[PDB]
PDB file of C-alpha atoms in Angstrom:
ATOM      1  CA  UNK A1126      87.232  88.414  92.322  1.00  0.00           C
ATOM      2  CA  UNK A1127      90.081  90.819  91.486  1.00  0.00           C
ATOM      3  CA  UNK A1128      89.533  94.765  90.568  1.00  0.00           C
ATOM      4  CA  UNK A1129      90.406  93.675  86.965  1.00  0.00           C
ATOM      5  CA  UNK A1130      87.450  91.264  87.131  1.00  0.00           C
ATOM      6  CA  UNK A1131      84.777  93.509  88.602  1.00  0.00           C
ATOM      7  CA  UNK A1132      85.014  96.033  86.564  1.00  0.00           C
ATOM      8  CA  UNK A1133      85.427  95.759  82.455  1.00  0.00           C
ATOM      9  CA  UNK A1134      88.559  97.179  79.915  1.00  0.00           C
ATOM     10  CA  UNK A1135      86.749 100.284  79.208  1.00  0.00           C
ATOM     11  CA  UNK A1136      85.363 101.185  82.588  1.00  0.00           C
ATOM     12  CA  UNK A1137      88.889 101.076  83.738  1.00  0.00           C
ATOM     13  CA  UNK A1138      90.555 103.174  81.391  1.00  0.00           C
ATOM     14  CA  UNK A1139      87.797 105.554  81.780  1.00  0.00           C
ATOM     15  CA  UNK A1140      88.012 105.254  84.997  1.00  0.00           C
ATOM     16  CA  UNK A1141      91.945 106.362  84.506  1.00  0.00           C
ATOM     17  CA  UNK A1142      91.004 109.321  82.351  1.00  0.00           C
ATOM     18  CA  UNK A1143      89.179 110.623  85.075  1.00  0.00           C
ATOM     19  CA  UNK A1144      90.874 110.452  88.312  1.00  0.00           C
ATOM     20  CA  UNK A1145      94.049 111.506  86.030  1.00  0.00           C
ATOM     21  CA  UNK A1146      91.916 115.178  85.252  1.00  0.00           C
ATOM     22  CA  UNK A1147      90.827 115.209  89.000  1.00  0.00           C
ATOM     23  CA  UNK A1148      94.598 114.479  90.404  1.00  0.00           C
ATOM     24  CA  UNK A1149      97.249 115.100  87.666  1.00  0.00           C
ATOM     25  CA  UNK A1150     100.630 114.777  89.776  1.00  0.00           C
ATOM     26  CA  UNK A1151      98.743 111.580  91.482  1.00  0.00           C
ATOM     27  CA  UNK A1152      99.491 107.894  90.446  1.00  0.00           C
ATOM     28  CA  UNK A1153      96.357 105.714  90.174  1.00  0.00           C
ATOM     29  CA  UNK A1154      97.548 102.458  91.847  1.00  0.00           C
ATOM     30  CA  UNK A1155      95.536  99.222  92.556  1.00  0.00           C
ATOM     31  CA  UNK A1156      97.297  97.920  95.907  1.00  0.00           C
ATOM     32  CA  UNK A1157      95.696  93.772  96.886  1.00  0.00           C
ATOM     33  CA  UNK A1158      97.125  91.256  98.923  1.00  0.00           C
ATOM     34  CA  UNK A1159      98.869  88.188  96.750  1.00  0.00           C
ATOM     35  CA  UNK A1160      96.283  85.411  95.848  1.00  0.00           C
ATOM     36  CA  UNK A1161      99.036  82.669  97.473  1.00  0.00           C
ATOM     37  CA  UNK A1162      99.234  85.198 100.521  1.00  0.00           C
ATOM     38  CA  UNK A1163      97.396  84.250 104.053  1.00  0.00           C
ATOM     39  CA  UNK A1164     100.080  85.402 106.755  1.00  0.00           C
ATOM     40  CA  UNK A1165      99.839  89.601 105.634  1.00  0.00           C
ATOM     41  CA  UNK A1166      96.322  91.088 106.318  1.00  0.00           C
ATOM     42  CA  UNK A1167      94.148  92.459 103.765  1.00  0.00           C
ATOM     43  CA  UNK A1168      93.838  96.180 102.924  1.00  0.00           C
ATOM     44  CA  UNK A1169      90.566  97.566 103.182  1.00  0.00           C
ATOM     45  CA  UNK A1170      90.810  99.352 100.556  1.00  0.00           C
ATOM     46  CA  UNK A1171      91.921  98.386  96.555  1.00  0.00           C
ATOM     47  CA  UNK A1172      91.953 101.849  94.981  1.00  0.00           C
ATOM     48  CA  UNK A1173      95.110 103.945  95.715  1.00  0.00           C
ATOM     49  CA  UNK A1174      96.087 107.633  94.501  1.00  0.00           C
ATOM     50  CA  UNK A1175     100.041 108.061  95.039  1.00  0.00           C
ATOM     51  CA  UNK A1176     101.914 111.576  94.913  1.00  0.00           C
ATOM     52  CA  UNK A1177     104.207 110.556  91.736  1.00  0.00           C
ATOM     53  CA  UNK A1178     107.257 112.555  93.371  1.00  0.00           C
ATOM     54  CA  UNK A1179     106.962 109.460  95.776  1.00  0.00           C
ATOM     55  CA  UNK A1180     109.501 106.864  95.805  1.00  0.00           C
ATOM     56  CA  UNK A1181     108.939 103.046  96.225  1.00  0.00           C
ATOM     57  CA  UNK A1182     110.795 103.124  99.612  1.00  0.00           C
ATOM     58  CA  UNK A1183     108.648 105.849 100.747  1.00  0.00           C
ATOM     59  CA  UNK A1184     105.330 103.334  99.661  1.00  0.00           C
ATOM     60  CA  UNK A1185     106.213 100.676 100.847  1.00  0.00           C
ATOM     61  CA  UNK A1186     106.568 102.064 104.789  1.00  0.00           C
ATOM     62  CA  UNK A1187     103.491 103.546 104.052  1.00  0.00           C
ATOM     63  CA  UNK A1188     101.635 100.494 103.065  1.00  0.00           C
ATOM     64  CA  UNK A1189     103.995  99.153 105.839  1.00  0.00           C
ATOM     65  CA  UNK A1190     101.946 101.329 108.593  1.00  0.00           C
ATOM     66  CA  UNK A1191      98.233 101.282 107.112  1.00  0.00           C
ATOM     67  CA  UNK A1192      98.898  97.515 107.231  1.00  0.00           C
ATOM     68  CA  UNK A1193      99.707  97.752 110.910  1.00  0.00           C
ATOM     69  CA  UNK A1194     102.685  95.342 110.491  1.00  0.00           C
ATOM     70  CA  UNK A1195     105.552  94.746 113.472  1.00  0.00           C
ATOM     71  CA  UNK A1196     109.053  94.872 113.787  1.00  0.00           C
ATOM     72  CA  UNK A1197     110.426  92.213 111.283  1.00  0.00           C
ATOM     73  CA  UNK A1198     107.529  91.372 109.205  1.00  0.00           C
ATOM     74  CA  UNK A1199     108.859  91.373 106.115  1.00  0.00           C
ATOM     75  CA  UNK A1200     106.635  91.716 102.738  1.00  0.00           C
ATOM     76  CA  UNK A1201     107.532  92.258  99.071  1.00  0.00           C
ATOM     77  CA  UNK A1202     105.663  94.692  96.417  1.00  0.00           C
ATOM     78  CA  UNK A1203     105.224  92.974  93.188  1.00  0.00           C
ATOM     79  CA  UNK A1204     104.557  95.333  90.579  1.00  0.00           C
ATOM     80  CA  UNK A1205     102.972  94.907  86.874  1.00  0.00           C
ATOM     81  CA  UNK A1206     103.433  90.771  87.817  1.00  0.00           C
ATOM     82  CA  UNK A1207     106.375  90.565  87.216  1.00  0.00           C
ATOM     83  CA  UNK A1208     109.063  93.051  88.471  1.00  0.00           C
ATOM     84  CA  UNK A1209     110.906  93.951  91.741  1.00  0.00           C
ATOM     85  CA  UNK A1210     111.848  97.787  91.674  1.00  0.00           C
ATOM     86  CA  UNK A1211     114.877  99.048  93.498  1.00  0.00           C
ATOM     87  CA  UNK A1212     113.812 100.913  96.373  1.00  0.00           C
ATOM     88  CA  UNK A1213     115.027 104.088  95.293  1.00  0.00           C
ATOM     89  CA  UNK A1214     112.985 103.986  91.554  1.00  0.00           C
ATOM     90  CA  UNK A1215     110.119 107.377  91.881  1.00  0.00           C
ATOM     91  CA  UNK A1216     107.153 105.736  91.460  1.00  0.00           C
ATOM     92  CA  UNK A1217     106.267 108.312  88.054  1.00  0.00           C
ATOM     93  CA  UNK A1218     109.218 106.026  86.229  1.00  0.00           C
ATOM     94  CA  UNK A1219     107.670 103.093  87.571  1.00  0.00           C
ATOM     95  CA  UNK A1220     104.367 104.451  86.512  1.00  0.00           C
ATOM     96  CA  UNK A1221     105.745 105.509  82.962  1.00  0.00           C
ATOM     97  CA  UNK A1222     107.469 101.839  82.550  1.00  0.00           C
ATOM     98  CA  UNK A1223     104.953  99.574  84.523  1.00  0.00           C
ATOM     99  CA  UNK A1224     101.699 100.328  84.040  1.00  0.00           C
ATOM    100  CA  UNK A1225      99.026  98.315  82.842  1.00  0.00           C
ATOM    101  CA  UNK A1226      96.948  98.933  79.221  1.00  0.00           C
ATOM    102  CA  UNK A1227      94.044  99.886  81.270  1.00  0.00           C
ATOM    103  CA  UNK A1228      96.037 102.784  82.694  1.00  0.00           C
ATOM    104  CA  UNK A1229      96.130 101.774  86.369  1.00  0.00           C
ATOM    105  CA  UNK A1230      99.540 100.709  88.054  1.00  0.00           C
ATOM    106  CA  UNK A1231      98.936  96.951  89.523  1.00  0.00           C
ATOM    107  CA  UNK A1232     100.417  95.866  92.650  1.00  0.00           C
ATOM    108  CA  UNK A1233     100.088  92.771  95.154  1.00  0.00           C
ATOM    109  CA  UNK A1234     101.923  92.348  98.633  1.00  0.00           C
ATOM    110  CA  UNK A1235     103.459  89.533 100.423  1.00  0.00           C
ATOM    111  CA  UNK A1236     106.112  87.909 102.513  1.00  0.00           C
ATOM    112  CA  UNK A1237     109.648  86.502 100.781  1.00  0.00           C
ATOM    113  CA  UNK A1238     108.732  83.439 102.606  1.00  0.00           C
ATOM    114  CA  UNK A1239     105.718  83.071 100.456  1.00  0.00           C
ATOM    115  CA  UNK A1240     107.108  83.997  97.401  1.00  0.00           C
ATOM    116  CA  UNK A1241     109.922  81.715  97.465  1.00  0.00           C
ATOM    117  CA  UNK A1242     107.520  79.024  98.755  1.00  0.00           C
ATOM    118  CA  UNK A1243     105.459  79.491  95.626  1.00  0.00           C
ATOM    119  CA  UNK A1244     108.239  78.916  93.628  1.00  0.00           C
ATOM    120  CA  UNK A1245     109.494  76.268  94.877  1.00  0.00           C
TER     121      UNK A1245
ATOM    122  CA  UNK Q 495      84.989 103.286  94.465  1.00  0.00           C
ATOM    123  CA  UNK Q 496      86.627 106.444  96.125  1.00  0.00           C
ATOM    124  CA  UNK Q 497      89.753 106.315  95.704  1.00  0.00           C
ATOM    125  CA  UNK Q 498      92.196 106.422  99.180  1.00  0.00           C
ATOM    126  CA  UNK Q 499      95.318 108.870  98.920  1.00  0.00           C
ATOM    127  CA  UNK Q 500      98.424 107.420 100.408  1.00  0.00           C
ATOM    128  CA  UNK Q 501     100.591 110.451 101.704  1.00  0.00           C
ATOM    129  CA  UNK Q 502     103.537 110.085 104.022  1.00  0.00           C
TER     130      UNK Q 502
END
């Protein structure tokens, strides 16, 4: 069961409303491993609040650490389901152009190698 | 349900 399936439309975006009031230059950001992905641990945690001066270079060596990962372990951030942001991107624009109708900002993680293994 | 922050 996903965070989108525990918890209904409204509750979300209510949910959004809040934390928005309580953190207002915070991005609300739902961070889970991809369904296809067994190599990457899980988080612990699903619910994220990112500074929105942040980049997507600076999150992902941050998810990088708090996932404990080595050397040359290589994973991917998949945002909204279907795009790959340049590294660079703040993540307020990716916020302002990605984000879901429920107000949060979806993401799942894994390897290339399971990506392109998926689609092919 | 909290939420975690993710600061660098």
């Amino acid at each position: 069961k996903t965070f989108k399936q525990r918890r209904t439309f409204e509750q979300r975006v209510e949910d959004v409303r809040l934390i928005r009031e309580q953190h207002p230059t915070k991005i609300p950001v739902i961070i889970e491993r991809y369904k296809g992905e067994k190599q990457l641990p899980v988080l612990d945690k699903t619910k994220f609040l990112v500074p929105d001066h942040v980049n997507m270079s600076e999150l992902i060596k941050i998810i990088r650490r708090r996932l404990q990962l080595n050397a040359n372990q290589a994973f991917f951030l998949l945002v909204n389901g279907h795009s790959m942001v340049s590294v660079s991107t703040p993540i307020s624009e990716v916020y302002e152009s990605e984000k879901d109708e429920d107000g949060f900002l979806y993401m799942v993680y894994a390897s290339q190698e399971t990506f392109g293994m998926k689609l092919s | 349900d909290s939420y975690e922050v993710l600061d660098l």
